[PDB]
Amino acid sequence: SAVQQKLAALEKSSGGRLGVALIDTADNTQVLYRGDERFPMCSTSKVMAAAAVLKQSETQKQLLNQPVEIKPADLVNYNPIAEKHVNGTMTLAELSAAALQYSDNTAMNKLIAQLGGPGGVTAFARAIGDETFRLDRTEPTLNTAIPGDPRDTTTPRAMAQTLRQLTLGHALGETQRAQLVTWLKGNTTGAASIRAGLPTSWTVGDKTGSGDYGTTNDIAVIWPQGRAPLVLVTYFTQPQQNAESRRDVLASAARIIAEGL
Ligand SMILES: *C(=O)N1C[C@H](NOS(=O)(=O)O)CC[C@H]1C(N)=O
């Protein structure tokens, strides 16, 4: 009830710019707030990159087990998993899991490289019907989050539709969809974001993101108790380049959405 008033009031109180897109798969209804504005994706772009490698593995049948060299020069700003394997190798499956569940930025860059560069991630988006997503840069510069810059952005509406296709539809093969869902459900970084605004009995798979301009993001597939799943994108960015993160705003948006159902 009064969901637009509530989302607008949350945004005004926060001082920033909030983007929300919900898909309720029980009845195909949607809730949108700035659903067609571009937002910097930051680490949420890793879902597209992992899904694109999963799609490649549908025809390169051993691709996920292929070793990839991790060198000291490859390390960037946040490499919790890759730093354990420097001067050795990690498989593409291990890199996908590290990128999704620990938000390892070196693992992300290896996914991007496997795909031929950022354009290869965008090409996969286009191949599954997403005409809005764009990846332009590698880690860490994809997180600059400069206002008005279209690089490394998407809209909430597009990314909710794509996450639905990837996790509940048929953009990926059956086994690969299940693998993506398993990875998202095992995310380690999400308890303060969308999940925090939902009843604890519901099951969530998600991927968070953060960047400059206090950018605080989360994209999630949600299995409520006793009812069909939801897909929810909450993107948030702020006026000051050095702004603090606001995961509480994402949780509040999810809480508003959960009471309106
Ligand atoms: C992704 O947005 N990033 C990589 C890592 N993500 O952790 S988060 O998903 O918990 O925010 C650190 C922050 C961010 C980056 N590299 O700036």
Numbering used by the authors: 27 to 57, 59 to 238, 240 to 252, 254 to 290
Paper text:
In particular, we assessed the structure of β-lactamase in complex with avibactam, which acylates the active serine residue without being hydrolyzed by the enzyme. CTX-M-14 crystals soaked with avibactam yielded a 2.3 Å resolution MicroED structure of the complex, with clear density accounting for the inhibitor at high occupancy in each of the two binding sites within the asymmetric unit of the crystal. nMS from this on-grid material indicated a 265 Da mass shift of the most intense peak and the corresponding salt adduct series relative to the apo-form spectrum. No mass corresponding to the unliganded form of CTX-M-14 was detected by nMS in the inhibitor-soaked sample, indicating effectively complete saturation of its binding sites.
By combining microcrystal electron diffraction with native mass spectrometry (ED-MS), we develop an approach to rapidly and accurately determine structures of biosynthetic or clinically relevant ligands bound to enzymes. We demonstrate this approach with the model protein lysozyme bound to its noncovalent ligand N,N′,N″-triacetylchitotriose (ACT), then use the cysteine protease papain as a scaffold on which to bind a panel of both known and potential inhibitors, including the epoxide-based covalent cysteine protease inhibitor E-64 (27), its commercially available chemical analogs, and analogs generated by biosynthetic reaction. Last, we extend the ED-MS workflow to interrogate crystals of the β-lactamase enzyme, CTX-M-14, which imparts resistance to β-lactam-containing antibiotics by hydrolyzing their four-membered ring structural motif. Overall, our results demonstrate that structures of protein–ligand complexes can be obtained directly from microcrystal slurries by ED-MS, with unambiguous confirmation of the identity of the bound ligands.
